[PDB]
Design an enzyme around this catalytic site. Structure first.
Site, short mmCIF file in Angstrom:
data_model
loop_
_atom_site.label_atom_id
_atom_site.label_comp_id
_atom_site.label_asym_id
_atom_site.label_seq_id
_atom_site.Cartn_x
_atom_site.Cartn_y
_atom_site.Cartn_z
CE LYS A 42 2.28 16.24 -3.44
NZ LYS A 42 2.93 16.70 -1.88
CB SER B 293 -5.26 17.63 0.38
OG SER B 293 -5.99 17.76 -0.36
CG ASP C 215 6.40 15.62 2.54
OD1 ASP C 215 5.85 15.57 3.28
OD2 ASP C 215 6.57 15.01 1.16
N1 LIG Z 1 -1.26 7.48 2.35
C1 LIG Z 1 -0.03 7.30 1.44
N2 LIG Z 1 0.61 7.37 0.84
C2 LIG Z 1 1.22 7.11 0.19
C3 LIG Z 1 2.07 8.68 0.89
C4 LIG Z 1 1.42 9.47 1.21
C5 LIG Z 1 1.60 11.04 0.88
C6 LIG Z 1 1.91 12.47 0.31
C7 LIG Z 1 2.36 11.54 -0.80
C8 LIG Z 1 3.46 12.55 -2.04
C9 LIG Z 1 3.48 12.14 -3.72
C10 LIG Z 1 2.44 11.63 -3.86
F1 LIG Z 1 2.59 11.00 -5.91
C11 LIG Z 1 0.66 10.84 -3.08
C12 LIG Z 1 0.84 10.65 -2.16
N3 LIG Z 1 2.38 13.21 0.62
C13 LIG Z 1 2.05 13.21 1.77
N4 LIG Z 1 1.22 11.71 2.45
C14 LIG Z 1 1.05 11.03 3.68
C15 LIG Z 1 2.58 11.23 4.66
C16 LIG Z 1 1.88 10.75 5.89
N5 LIG Z 1 0.65 11.55 6.67
C17 LIG Z 1 -0.02 11.49 5.61
C18 LIG Z 1 0.02 11.68 3.71
N6 LIG Z 1 0.20 9.36 1.65
#
Ligand SMILES: Nc1nccc(-c2c(-c3ccc(F)cc3)ncn2C2CCNCC2)n1
Ligand SMILES: NS(=O)(=O)c1ccc(N2C(=O)CCC2=O)nc1
Ligand SMILES: N[C@@]12C[C@H]3C[C@@H](C1)C[C@](O)(C3)C2
Ligand SMILES: [Ca+2]
Ligand SMILES: [Ca+2]
Ligand SMILES: [Ca+2]
Ligand SMILES: [Ca+2]
Length: 345
Positions: free
Chosen positions: A48, A32, A163
């Protein structure tokens, strides 16, 4: 660094004081995500927290896989790493992994727009997807489930693929037919089918293939692209599936100019080159970037490929503690990139 604890999404996050004002912005793959303020640089970041990263051999290897992949990705249209941290002081204490990237406020479903997207804006969005795909494909990394919700977008329509290279009810509407139907072989152009589905929807406002199940989706696909030849059956192991497809009434390919009414003729031409059932005839990302539809954005000096990526670990079965130790090594060895990594052209 001093860490603090905060309950977010009903669980305790333990983060360095460097990252402040965490607030949840949704789930990610196996984790999350919270938005945060990076007090070191004044930048907004997304953090995350991986969910149970070492619960089983499946979780442990996917944790290693994701960290290795994100440490390798250095491209403006691909999610990469600003930081990776753990509250653990040693391997013996190590059980939680947090990944940090630049904050992206939205996904493609959310793209800020004024009533409808202009063609110039659609060009920019699709161009960026293709630039990111050229990079990941050049390292033999495939997304396999590219879709609007896997495209992170910021307030200025800058886009990053996320992803990718990994692996709840997911949408299948953007999946390449060879993936959705488990055909025996496919290549990197699975992702180009998805680009075609995404671009179509940006032009019309409607899902291209909104099938209720895989059979319904296949029928919608065949109505657009026409009945395939016997050569395509070569790819399909299941006899019942092959018999079914062969038994369908023949359908001609549609003229895409009759489907995407009023679209830029260059957009229609690109869609004809992406939405091809024969994955060996589908345009590649690098080829698509040279297409005249993107003429105002294309810049060969700014469409780079990736450094070679060693995926030999994928064929190996290791114990949970071996994946854990390898992951810890990757955490400890991470070198944060410079804040400014770009120069005027
Ligand atoms: N707001 C935002 N900004 C950048 C990334 C993400 C992110 C990541 C992610 C991946 C790697 C990391 F190191 C940090 C975060 N995984 C899912 N999401 C979002 C992608 C858009 N829908 C909500 C989840 N979300
Ligand atoms: N599926 S549709 O018949 O509702 C439809 C909707 C919109 C469109 N379209 C435009 O208006 C501009 C470009 C484009 O593709 N075409 C078909
Ligand atoms: N969304 C679509 C696009 C093409 C024309 C029409 C509407 C039938 C269909 O099967 C092919 C799905
Ligand atoms: Ca340029
Ligand atoms: Ca600079
Ligand atoms: Ca910038
Ligand atoms: Ca130049």
């Amino acid at each position: 660094p001093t860490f603090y604890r905060q309950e977010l999404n009903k669980t305790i996050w333990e983060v360095p004081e460097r990252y402040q004002n965490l607030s949840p912005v949704g789930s990610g793959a196996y984790g999350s995500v919270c938005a945060a303020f990076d007090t070191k640089t004044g930048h907004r970041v997304a953090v995350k927290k991986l969910s149970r990263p070492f619960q089983s051999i499946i979780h442990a290897k996917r944790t290693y896989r994701e960290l290795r992949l994100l440490k390798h990705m250095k491209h403006e249209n691909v999610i990469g790493l600003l930081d990776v941290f753990t509250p653990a002081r040693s391997l013996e204490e190590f059980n939680d992994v947090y990944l940090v990237t630049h904050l992206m406020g939205a996904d493609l479903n959310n793209i800020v727009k004024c009533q409808k997207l202009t063609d110039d804006h659609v060009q920019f969005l699709i161009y960026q997807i293709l630039r990111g795909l050229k990079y990941i494909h050049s390292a033999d990394i495939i997304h396999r489930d590219l879709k609007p919700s896997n495209l992170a977008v910021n307030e200025d329509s800058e886009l990053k693929i996320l992803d990718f290279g990994l692996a709840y009810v997911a949408t299948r509407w953007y999946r390449a037919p060879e993936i959705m139907l488990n055909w025996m072989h496919y290549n990197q152009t699975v992702d180009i089918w998805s680009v075609g589905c995404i671009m179509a929807e940006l032009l019309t406002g409607r899902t291209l293939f909104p099938g209720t199940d895989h059979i319904d989706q296949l029928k919608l696909i065949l109505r657009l692209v026409g009945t395939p030849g016997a050569e395509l059956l070569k790819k399909i192991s299941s006899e019942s599936a092959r018999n079914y497809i062969q038994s369908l009434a023949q359908m001609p390919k549609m003229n895409f100019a009759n489907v995407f009414i009023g679209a830029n003729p260059l957009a229609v031409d690109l869609l004809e080159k992406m939405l091809v059932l024969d994955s060996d005839k589908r345009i590649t990302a690098a080829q698509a970037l040279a297409h005249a539809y993107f003429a105002q954005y294309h810049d060969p000096d700014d469409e780079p490929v990736a450094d070679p990526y060693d995926q030999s670990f994928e064929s190996r079965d290791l114990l949970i503690d071996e994946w854990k130790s390898l992951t810890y090594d990757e955490v400890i060895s991470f070198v944060p990139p410079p804040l400014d990594q770009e120069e005027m052209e």
